[PDB]
Ligand SMILES: Nc1ncnc2c1ncn2[C@@H]1O[C@H](COP(=O)(O)OP(=O)(O)OP(O)(O)=S)[C@@H](O)[C@H]1O
Ligand SMILES: Nc1ncnc2c1ncn2[C@@H]1O[C@H](COP(=O)(O)OP(=O)(O)OP(O)(O)=S)[C@@H](O)[C@H]1O
């Protein structure tokens with residue numbers, strides 16, 4: 082009767098049908114049985130990584146006993162679930178806990194083996210002392226109490242294997258994680274338990290996707306557990322959608338009910354610079370109130386003539402998680418991908434050969450054609466200076482994230498000595514900086530969709546190349562802590578400045594003599610950039626002037642530029658040895674200097690608009 | 703406190719509260735953990751969820767759920783004996 | 788009953804000084820001497836809260852000890868004191884007995900100590916307000932009781 086106070090009844094719980102169906106894993110359960118039914122030392126311990134199913138095996142054995150598939154040596158035996166936490170509850174006096182545990186042990190021995198104690202998280206059996214969890218050591222080695230335990234793989238060697246007198250009384254059972262084909266079956270069996278809790282239906286083509294998809298995207302966790310979450314979340318989200326309106330009709334309404342209040346409390350601003358902001362916000366409101374009322378119409382076109390989860394809700398879940406977009410190109414993204422070297426051309430000018438290669442390994446990955454285990458694209462573009470090869474790697478990180486500072490840049494010119502490698506991989510255990518991990522590593526392990534940029538790579542020491550050697554071609558590198566980080570979704574970009582003027586084989590042979598063939602072989606196309614012709618500078622001129630104008634709008638201060646000045650600046654863009662950097666200095670020598678002189682000398686105030694005009698030699702405002 | 707009007711208004715962050723709710727109402731292992739750099743708003747989201755529950759914008763399963771803010775500091779206050787914690 | 792460590796130490800000190808004294812039964816004046824001369828004593832500021840002089844709390848109760856003919860057991864007045872103390876702990880729901888609880892039980896249990904505290908000037912309505920101005924609801928030990936005044940100094944003062 083002391084076993085009623087400190088434990089529940091697993092077999093009784095399994096009798097009333099309160100446990101999930103256990104599928105497969107025949108070998109593990111048969112070994113648990115043939116260990117649990119020997120003369121002495123008859124107590125197994127399941128062992129293995131967290132999530133692969135180790136309480137599932139004990140619950141399967143309990144259901145199996147209740148049914149009657151077990152041998153004669155185990156027919157009609159009850160399994161009790163010991164609870165070490167509720168025993169040390171009130172034991173402040175000097176012997177009460179030992180008294181409790183002794184009563185429990187005596188009561189277990191008082192039966193004739195009709196009880197199988199099952200301790201979960203048994204690594205907690207070492208403490209309870211303050212000579213505790215130690216009075217069990219005699220009864221263990223004789224086979225009185227049949228113990229079924231299950232702890233993860235690495236708290237075993239941390240709490241138990243430290244005590245080789247106690248770990249002798251345990252027989253280990255290793256529980257390896259299943260494969261995709263087996264996880265599919267486990268899900269096929271468990272589906273009808275979620276189909277009830279959520280009032281929905283789940284499609285087998287979705288049960289296959291929730292297991293194939295969650296095997297190449299979520300690598301930090303193990304099997305089935307990392308494949309049941311997708312199904313459960315998809316169902317819960319679908320039920321939410323069923324009750325209320327669908328998504329993308331809810332957020333459009335939530336933000337509209339906010340822009341209203343914004344413009345309402347903004348229109349009462351007795352101000353003049355705030356009138357250009359109100360007249361700009363008042364347009365996005367009418368633009369949103371357009372597609373909102375279009376969605377409410379397109380929803381009735383379907384509601385007059387999305388009721389079970391498919392292989393699409395799963396992808397949407399594994400995309401909201403982990404940030405990686407793996408969807409189906411829902412007709413809004415494809416129209417944007419189709420004109421990409423057109424949205425990149427607003428920031429980079431020329432280099433058509435290189436824009437149509439960076440942009441070419443994004444489509445052939447969003448359409449599901451690239452190798453699923455290798456980086457999305459790994460190519461190095463190199464050429465003369467000031468040509469636009471560090472700008473392209475920023476016009477690209479802005480097309481995908483809408484923020485130029487959401488990417489990972491490391492300036493490879495500080496890696497002059499080989500010992501500077503530990504800066505991006507961590508320091509081995511037992512050294513100064515170890516509870517910090519790597520620096521490149523920990524940056525990608527948190528958001529595995531960024532675009533890495535190794536700037537000025539040939540200035541480094543030829544060992545960091547050999548570190549990168551396996552990043553390309555496999556997308557993996559492990560830090561000090563032993564955590565493997567995957568790169569199979571990033572875009573690897575390496576700039577350079579080799580050759581410096583050689584036509585095509587003074588540079589192609591200067592790359593070959595600075596890098597090794599095993600490093601050139603992992604790369605995709607080696608893009609060559611080209612100098613700037615006189616025509617393709619008259620356009621960078623416009624870009625620069627637009628930039629400066631946008632920078633000036635902090636004072637509502639514009640400026641008018643005449644075509645003579647616009648083609649004077651571009652003709653004073655000179656020296657096809659320095660690219661397009663001199664022009665940014667010419668602009669500030671000509672316009673910016675005298676504008677700033679006039680600006681703090683009175684005689685120019687906000688709201689004005691200054692026209693530039695080419696004096697016979699210089700520019701006059 | 704959300705009923706008594708003592709929490710600041712919470713603006714924006716719709717995707718996050720949506721995901722928090724849908725994780726908070728699934729069958730097993732429903733424990734959302736807001737993670738991210740310090741300052742970007744992680745208590746503000748929970749306060750927004752509380753005000754949203756008081757208002758009524760939540761799905762059916764989360765009607766009248768009475769969020770509770772635990773405290774493990776005042777729980778280990780005086781427990782020098784063997785089982786007091 | 789439900790003891791805290793200070794009442795346990797007071798009972799142990801009174802029992803050691805009683806077994807040294809050689810008595811058939813331990814008087815309440817042993818416990819009173821143990822509590823007024825206790826380290827970190829919360830009885831002398833308790834009587835400071837009700838305006839009682841401390842120059843008589845070691846003389847007029849000392850005369851209740853050196854008139855007895857020098858293992859004792861607890862007097863029935865002391866058991867009634869602990870009984871009314873445990874009863875008086877049920878309103879403020881403090882889970883353990885305290886030194887002020889021992890004091891109010893001794894003031895209600897034996898009328899001999901109540902006679903002395905009434906002759907020095909103290910009412911049970913006033914000494915029930917003696918602690919609330921020095922306390923400020925209770926665990927087992929005593930690390931409350933104006934914690935700002937014992938773990939800080941005043942820069943403005
Ligand atoms: N063979 C299986 N058949 C059916 N469901 C399974 C099977 N293996 C695991 N599961 C389910 O997958 C999840 C695994 O959870 P558990 O196995 O209880 O956790 P665990 O494997 O013990 O990991 P730890 O060490 O306890 S944290 C549960 O939802 C189980 O119901
Ligand atoms: N084709 C181009 N289109 C637009 N801006 C360009 C172009 N080429 C250079 N620029 C400008 O030049 C600056 C950036 O030049 P970068 O390409 O970053 O220099 P680089 O190509 O990395 O050469 P090095 O070897 O790194 S100095 C920015 O101010 C750009 O506006």
Ligand SMILES: Nc1ncnc2c1ncn2[C@@H]1O[C@H](COP(=O)(O)OP(=O)(O)OP(O)(O)=S)[C@@H](O)[C@H]1O
Nearest residue numbers: 710711712713714715739740741742743744745746
């Ligand atoms: N979306 C938001 N709406 C309204 N106020 C916000 C929002 N996000 C942040 N704030 C305010 O900005 C501050 C952010 O503080 P918190 O988000 O509570 O701190 P935190 O983000 O939790 O970081 P830590 O780790 O808790 S110190 C508070 O003053 C919030 O009131």
